[PDB]
Subunit: 281 residues, 4 copies
């Protein structure tokens, strides 16, 4: 009843995923380094949204440093050993959770700036300079413990596959549900609640279109979640497959893994769209 025990990634992933990773690596390096140079070295962070997009650019730069390891592990497989596999996985997790927590924080900042426009200028300073660290980076760093523990390289079938290796499959299901939860649902629920209240409080602000700093952050968050949504659907289906709820054939269990691979490579475009909304607005 074992399935196909994964299939050798289609020969085309292995030229496509390397290509996607390299495009995202180039765009991420150039764009996020330019954002850090302009908005975080020369200190022209004008709004408090540009404070959080600096945090996004730092997280995305950290991830795109390790993206060439993803490309190499796509073409060939892992050569870099165990410590660097752990480093790549914890950096991937830090980016994963920090970016979406930062987006939730930008939604909170927009909610405080629009809805509580009279009295929330002092909470908007603490939330962006002292509370952002303990609400984004500390939760993002505390969720790399499963990757400090389980992210080892398995010397296998002349493969050496760098992945999170768990004692059993229930751990995989639990941690994929945890990823889905604290990376899509709760930050997504917070963002949706903040923006629904913003739209309800802005719908009668005389009509005066306060859709300025709102449109940029709406585009940023919508593009981020559009990049990540197919991957989250794939891993939710995969987690329900592992939980013996989707008892279909092993070929479905392999096509969902292929879906996860391409949609995860395509979800790394979130590291590129923060600088893109500085090229455009």
């Amino acid at each position: 009843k074992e399935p196909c025990f994964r299939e050798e990634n289609a020969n085309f992933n292995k030229i496509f995923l390397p290509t996607i990773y390299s495009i995202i690596f180039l765009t991420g390096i150039v764009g996020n380094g330019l954002v850090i140079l302009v908005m975080g070295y020369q200190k022209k962070l004008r709004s408090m949204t540009d404070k959080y997009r600096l945090h996004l650019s730092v997280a995305d730069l950290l991830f795109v440093i390790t993206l060439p390891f993803w490309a190499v592990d796509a073409v060939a497989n892992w050569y870099f050993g165990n410590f660097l596999c752990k480093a790549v996985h914890v950096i991937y997790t830090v980016n994963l959770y920090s970016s979406v927590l930062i987006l939730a924080f930008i939604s909170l900042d927009r909610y405080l700036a629009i809805v509580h426009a009279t009295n929330s200028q002092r909470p908007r300073k603490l939330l962006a300079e002292k509370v952002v660290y303990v609400g984004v980076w500390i939760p993002a760093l505390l969720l790399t413990i499963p990757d400090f523990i389980f992210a080892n390289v398995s010397e296998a079938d002349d493969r050496y596959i760098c992945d999170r290796f768990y004692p059993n499959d229930l751990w995989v299901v639990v941690f994929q549900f945890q990823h889905i939860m604290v990376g899509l649902i709760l930050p997504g629920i917070v963002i949706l609640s903040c923006y629904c209240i913003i739209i309800s409080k802005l719908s009668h602000s005389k009509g005066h279109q306060k859709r300025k700093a709102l449109k940029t952050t709406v585009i940023l968050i919508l593009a981020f979640f559009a990049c990540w949504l197919p991957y989250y659907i794939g891993i939710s289906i995969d987690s329900f497959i592992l939980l013996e709820i989707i008892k279909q054939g092993c070929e479905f269990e392999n096509t969902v893994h292929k879906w996860i691979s391409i949609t995860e490579a395509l979800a790394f475009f979130h590291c590129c769209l923060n600088p893109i909304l500085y090229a455009f607005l």
Copy 2:
């Protein structure tokens, strides 16, 4: 004579269709809930088109409530129940016909507002206030009766198929003709007669501002019919296959069924494009 076998949905579709359904679910919930909040709960409807577009938002929200059942059915056939299968099909039919009848009513509103801009302020108000129910929702609720009668969960082996199971194949053909007719042809003929007589009374006149509120109607209706056209082509081809008129083999029938599934999933994006035009125009 060769009763064919519906080959089970390509493993791909079993992850594509949930992905499309989930994208439409998120976009439709957020957009239509925000339209009902803004246009329907806060009374920011500024024209007669916005009342009909509020009706579209209500119908689309009703459908995207049941869309998660569609995604689960795309993965795991049916473990919700016969009553919930009936409710899902009834809501699907209500959306199907109410949305296109609302679009036809929008075309009548534009016809009366442009061709009869001097004596049509009461029949437009009377239309959008009282006749919209009798001409949109009563047809949508009295023509969903075949879902109350026929839509049931056949437990074919382990595949609990939730679909309309008519007594005869001719019933399937005649109801697909009914759907094609009162979902593409008659409302489509009405919408083109109302917009060809406007194009002809907007040139013989040379008008403007109204010209422009006519763009957000033309784009809405064109996008709806562009979403639904591949599905209607597919189901008309399926109906002519099922009358033993086409007879291109079982492989062609399987291809048509896959086309119908994919392009029906893609045609549900009409539930997203009503609030998208409130986000662009």
Copy 3:
């Protein structure tokens, strides 16, 4: 001798060509009927290029009237008979040659309007009122004689194929080379010469006022030839196969035929891009 077995349409190209033909049929009827209504019957043509574009709309309407027969012949085969096969092929050829000759006349009209800006107002009117018929419709109605001679319905097997049935394959080659010539090369050379001289006499002045008006015709001609270029590549390669010059495989003359089918369906969008440019003025 190996006769090179001509496989039947794929099962997707039945259900795709029919979809492409239906989209183009709907768009062509609606748009070209509106153009003939407004810029034709209502005499709202005011630019001396709208006359030629009215001619395009007449040709495109004539073709999209016969497009449903193309969709039926895509799904089923020709049940309409020899005379109506001849009529459909004649209308196809008339559209084929008249549309490209009208675009050549548009380019020549812009050449006379820009290069000969002072003298050519009476030659332009003569060209658009009297010379246009004998230079577009008469050549298009004289190149359709081989359709009156050879287009026939062949009852081979159960497939009533409606196509131009020649004595030899050398006839196919010569009537594909004359198609390539009169449809891409000679009108294309005329259009390229006219627009190169236009640019050399716009860019040798502060031409900015008339570097629009020109933009619409440039977009129209470029979109037409972009639609028709893959088809012309396919049929040129097929003509060289039929000359036994390419002589590659038997799977390459079924790849070059499923290409010709797909790209000929996709080239019929030229009947839709003349009214679409009136939406994007």
Copy 4:
């Protein structure tokens, strides 16, 4: 041992000639119009326009030989050894000259914004005398292997024209030279120039962040986006030929197909200079 790569598929024998013909038409028309307008009607206003004139000359030179690529894609090289050498030489000249011209564009912009005061002699020196020795002399010096190793190999029935080296280590070293002096070194120079420009244009108060460094950024980004999939493919192939990427023999065929299509798609760089003169973006 060798995978044994012998197939150009069948789509890539009709797709690639189609892509080559589209690029041949667009490149011939656009680059001829640029050379006529800029290099003959001296409408070179800027110093980007002189380098873009150099790009148009190089791209015109390559699209002259593009029909030979179209014939070699569907037929094989029946033109001769001298024509194989000439086409490969012109291909190499375009390859290196275009990217070195873009490096010169980046350096000219660097001198324009950063050293805005004391750079009008260096920017007139580079564009008038140093551009030849830094673009065309290097591009004609790295085409020496196209004079030495490019030969039509009769081999089997198909006379294949390619640059044939003694060992497979020469293929690797020349592919590495290609990657270096076509992507890395000019790309590093361009990135350094534009990063310093951004660090200087930002500080500048109200320095339109974009000015005319929009059109050059778009041109260089589009060029490198066109060439990046090809460079990923040939780097993967180069490490394959070093016996580093041992992932089978179907992977080498997949990589070679990737190289063929992504090399044809990389020739759209030969028409980005005129299309950015048709958009003025």
